[PDB]
Design an enzyme around this catalytic site. Structure first.
Site, PDB file in Angstrom:
ATOM      1  N   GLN A  20       2.461 -49.035  38.900  1.00 61.12           N
ATOM      2  CA  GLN A  20       2.887 -48.448  37.742  1.00 61.12           C
ATOM      3  C   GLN A  20       4.362 -48.328  37.527  1.00 61.12           C
ATOM      4  O   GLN A  20       5.136 -48.312  36.300  1.00 61.12           O
ATOM      5  CB  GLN A  20       2.100 -47.128  37.208  1.00 61.12           C
ATOM      6  CG  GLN A  20       0.511 -47.548  37.444  1.00 61.12           C
ATOM      7  CD  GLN A  20      -0.162 -46.339  36.852  1.00 61.12           C
ATOM      8  OE1 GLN A  20      -0.658 -45.674  37.759  1.00 61.12           O
ATOM      9  NE2 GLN A  20      -0.290 -46.302  35.800  1.00 61.12           N
ATOM     10  N   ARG A  78       3.837 -36.921  44.634  1.00 58.51           N
ATOM     11  CA  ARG A  78       2.727 -37.672  44.944  1.00 58.51           C
ATOM     12  C   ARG A  78       3.108 -39.018  44.318  1.00 58.51           C
ATOM     13  O   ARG A  78       3.334 -39.332  43.159  1.00 58.51           O
ATOM     14  CB  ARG A  78       1.495 -37.160  44.209  1.00 58.51           C
ATOM     15  CG  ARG A  78       0.381 -38.116  44.320  1.00 58.51           C
ATOM     16  CD  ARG A  78      -1.030 -37.792  43.872  1.00 58.51           C
ATOM     17  NE  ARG A  78      -1.926 -38.658  44.094  1.00 58.51           N
ATOM     18  CZ  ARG A  78      -2.628 -39.407  43.292  1.00 58.51           C
ATOM     19  NH1 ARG A  78      -2.607 -39.206  41.758  1.00 58.51           N
ATOM     20  NH2 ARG A  78      -3.652 -40.370  43.684  1.00 58.51           N
ATOM     21  N   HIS A 123      -3.903 -47.366  45.539  1.00 56.54           N
ATOM     22  CA  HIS A 123      -3.777 -46.975  44.089  1.00 56.54           C
ATOM     23  C   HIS A 123      -3.809 -48.237  43.450  1.00 56.54           C
ATOM     24  O   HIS A 123      -3.090 -48.356  42.676  1.00 56.54           O
ATOM     25  CB  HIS A 123      -2.728 -46.114  43.781  1.00 56.54           C
ATOM     26  CG  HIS A 123      -2.712 -45.155  42.551  1.00 56.54           C
ATOM     27  ND1 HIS A 123      -2.490 -43.926  42.607  1.00 56.54           N
ATOM     28  CD2 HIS A 123      -3.261 -45.670  41.385  1.00 56.54           C
ATOM     29  CE1 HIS A 123      -2.724 -43.437  41.078  1.00 56.54           C
ATOM     30  NE2 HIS A 123      -3.152 -44.485  40.566  1.00 56.54           N
ATOM     31  N   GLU A 168      -9.016 -42.831  43.054  1.00 55.99           N
ATOM     32  CA  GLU A 168      -9.921 -43.289  41.867  1.00 55.99           C
ATOM     33  C   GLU A 168     -10.680 -44.502  42.278  1.00 55.99           C
ATOM     34  O   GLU A 168     -10.660 -45.346  41.431  1.00 55.99           O
ATOM     35  CB  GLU A 168      -9.459 -43.271  40.402  1.00 55.99           C
ATOM     36  CG  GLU A 168      -8.462 -42.086  39.943  1.00 55.99           C
ATOM     37  CD  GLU A 168      -8.514 -42.017  38.319  1.00 55.99           C
ATOM     38  OE1 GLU A 168      -8.908 -43.186  37.591  1.00 55.99           O
ATOM     39  OE2 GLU A 168      -7.922 -41.123  37.892  1.00 55.99           O
ATOM     40  N   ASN A 310      -8.571 -35.989  40.183  1.00 56.52           N
ATOM     41  CA  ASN A 310      -7.768 -36.131  38.923  1.00 56.52           C
ATOM     42  C   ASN A 310      -8.822 -35.800  37.981  1.00 56.52           C
ATOM     43  O   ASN A 310      -9.944 -36.145  37.640  1.00 56.52           O
ATOM     44  CB  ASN A 310      -7.740 -37.661  38.960  1.00 56.52           C
ATOM     45  CG  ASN A 310      -6.754 -38.234  39.969  1.00 56.52           C
ATOM     46  OD1 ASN A 310      -6.166 -37.386  40.881  1.00 56.52           O
ATOM     47  ND2 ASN A 310      -6.616 -39.661  40.021  1.00 56.52           N
ATOM     48  N   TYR A 312      -8.681 -35.051  33.690  1.00 50.21           N
ATOM     49  CA  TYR A 312      -8.312 -35.400  32.331  1.00 50.21           C
ATOM     50  C   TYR A 312      -8.939 -34.941  31.017  1.00 50.21           C
ATOM     51  O   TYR A 312      -8.465 -34.589  29.934  1.00 50.21           O
ATOM     52  CB  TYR A 312      -7.964 -36.883  31.990  1.00 50.21           C
ATOM     53  CG  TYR A 312      -6.800 -37.427  32.848  1.00 50.21           C
ATOM     54  CD1 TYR A 312      -5.869 -37.536  32.341  1.00 50.21           C
ATOM     55  CD2 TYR A 312      -7.088 -38.068  34.116  1.00 50.21           C
ATOM     56  CE1 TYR A 312      -4.653 -38.005  33.304  1.00 50.21           C
ATOM     57  CE2 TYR A 312      -6.102 -38.593  35.066  1.00 50.21           C
ATOM     58  CZ  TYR A 312      -4.792 -38.439  34.427  1.00 50.21           C
ATOM     59  OH  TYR A 312      -3.898 -38.982  35.149  1.00 50.21           O
ATOM     60  N   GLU A 377      -3.901 -35.331  39.827  1.00 47.36           N
ATOM     61  CA  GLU A 377      -3.523 -35.897  38.530  1.00 47.36           C
ATOM     62  C   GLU A 377      -4.366 -34.977  37.301  1.00 47.36           C
ATOM     63  O   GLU A 377      -5.248 -34.591  37.375  1.00 47.36           O
ATOM     64  CB  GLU A 377      -4.090 -37.070  38.060  1.00 47.36           C
ATOM     65  CG  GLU A 377      -3.227 -38.372  38.835  1.00 47.36           C
ATOM     66  CD  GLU A 377      -3.641 -39.770  38.780  1.00 47.36           C
ATOM     67  OE1 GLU A 377      -4.119 -40.190  37.582  1.00 47.36           O
ATOM     68  OE2 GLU A 377      -3.607 -40.488  39.630  1.00 47.36           O
TER      69      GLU A 377
END
Ligand SMILES: [Cl-]
Ligand SMILES: [Cl-]
Ligand code: NA
Length: 473
Positions: A20, A78, A123, A168, A310, A312, A377
């Site tokens: 990313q 991280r 990742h 994830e 994580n 959200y 996250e």
């Protein structure tokens, strides 16, 4: 103001991932990964046909990342390591010294600036050479993952004391459940995604045991895993809708966490049983869900020093079955929706439901006997802008909810890293969805990072170690 103050030892920071942010996709010996492949061969899968060829250019600009982390007052950063930057061929026969040097440079820069590194090994950026063997559905990848981890522990573990094996897997397994989705974009729903999960669990366990055997005594760090999970709220208060939400937790979090974090180990019973029944009813000789032997169950259970989460958003769950046959969603036995009243983001999947965070933390506490939980996250998308009031409010509300979980509910949350330090390549969404607390100008070759209001507010929270009065209920 107790409920508004962070525990003294609690670690606050921010998070990124290699593909990313790094760019330099073929620089200085780095080998190709499955995201290079996807974005080069299938730009039709990605908003704007975007690629991570440059992204934030953090391969070159890592010192700028450290600068903004220092400004923020992050205690922890991280980040992930690119497997193919270190082992260009995937296998451990060739180690790319340029990659070793790069991550050492970043680690040393962080430490020189008083920021602790937290490293995600995987990742989502699998070397293409390993995908060509089948990738995650092929169990040979568990030993390859062990060998990759050994290189990381050997080279970096004298300075890195916080590790996440995987990020994830619930998400990246889905790269084996659609021809047009997440890399490697293979359409084996209900079959290959489960095989991928199985390999990942095996790989994780091998890495943990490796650390115990070859590194822990000398290095003294901690090894966990980052699991995403949405809260699933019963659509009505019925027992039937509650059952559906328990199914959701087990089919999303429990898939990975029951084998590792419980005393019993193995997959959750409901996962085994529903897939067994569905497979039989469709005429398969064998269940579509792979099996662990008793010896494997024992090997895998207990492989953790903390749980990475994580978080959200939330969904509503009701009793029923939907989705295509075969698929993990169909197998899971819940009908999922979103409430129209929940505030929106720039991401279709992400609604603002801060109380869901507290509910999830309690679910975890009860299911896994209050493991130490590091929030790896949490964050919010918009389409752009520095006056990011939605993001500010997302953070202040989620942090308040987490603090209630800690202080009122006794949940052992030990740290929190905001997703993300800066706007970056958001996978199939390209650069169209912004998750940063720092903005990045992707039309400026220098990729300047500039603070949004959320970065300023988070800096204030990190400095004062409390939620400021103006954000309290
Ligand atoms: Cl009701
Ligand atoms: Cl004030
Ligand atoms: Na080495």
């Amino acid at each position: 103001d107790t409920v508004y103050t962070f525990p003294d030892e609690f670690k606050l920071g921010a998070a990124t991932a290699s593909y990313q942010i790094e760019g330099a996709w073929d620089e200085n010996g780095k080998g190709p990964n499955i995201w290079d492949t996807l974005t080069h061969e299938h730009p039709d899968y990605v908003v704007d046909g975007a690629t991570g060829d440059i992204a934030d250019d953090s391969y070159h600009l890592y010192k700028e990342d450290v600068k903004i982390l220092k400004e923020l007052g992050a205690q922890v950063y991280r980040f992930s390591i690119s497997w193919a930057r270190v082992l260009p061929e995937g296998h451990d026969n060739i180690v790319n010294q340029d990659g070793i040097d790069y991550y050492n440079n970043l680690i040393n820069e962080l430490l020189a600036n008083g920021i602790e590194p937290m490293v995600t090994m995987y990742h989502w950026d699998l070397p293409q050479a390993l995908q060509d063997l089948g990738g995650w559905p092929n169990l040979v990848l568990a030993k390859y993952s062990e060998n990759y981890a050994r290189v990381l522990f050997k080279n970096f573990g004298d300075r890195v004391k916080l590790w996440l094996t995987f990020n994830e897997p619930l998400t990246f397994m889905d790269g084996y459940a659609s021809e047009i989705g997440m890399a490697p974009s293979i359409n084996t729903p209900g079959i290959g995604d489960y095989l991928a999960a199985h390999t990942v669990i095996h790989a994780h366990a091998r890495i943990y045991h490796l650390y115990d055997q070859e590194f822990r005594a000398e290095q003294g760090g901690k090894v966990g895993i980052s699991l995403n999970i949405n809260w699933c709220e019963p659509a009505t208060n019925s027992a039937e809708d509650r059952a559906s939400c328990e199914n959701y937790q087990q089919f999303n979090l429990g898939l990975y966490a029951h084998p590792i974090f419980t005393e019993e180990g193995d997959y959750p019973a409901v996962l085994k049983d529903r897939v067994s029944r569905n497979s039989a009813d469709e005429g398969y000789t064998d269940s579509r869900l792979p099996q662990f032997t008793a010896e494997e169950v024992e090997y895998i259970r207990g492989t953790h020093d903390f749980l990475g989460i994580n978080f959200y958003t939330a969904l509503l769950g009701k009793s029923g079955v939907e989705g295509y046959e075969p698929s993990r969603y169909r197998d899971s036995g819940v009908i999922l929706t979103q409430d129209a009243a929940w505030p929106i983001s720039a991401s279709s999947w992400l609604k603002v439901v801060p109380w869901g965070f507290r509910k999830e933390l309690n679910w975890i506490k009860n299911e896994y006997n209050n493991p130490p939980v590091f929030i790896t996250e949490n964050g919010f998308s918009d389409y752009g802008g520095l006056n990011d009031t939605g993001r500010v409010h997302y953070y202040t509300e989620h942090l308040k909810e987490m603090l209630k979980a800690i202080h009122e509910d006794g949940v052992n949350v030990i740290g929190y890293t905001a997703w993300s330090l800066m706007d970056n390549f958001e996978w199939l969404r390209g650069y169209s969805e912004k998750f940063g607390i720092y903005a990045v100008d992707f039309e400026d070759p220098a990729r300047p990072r500039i603070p949004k209001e959320s970065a300023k507010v988070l800096a204030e929270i990190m400095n004062t170690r409390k939620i400021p009065e103006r954000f309290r209920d």
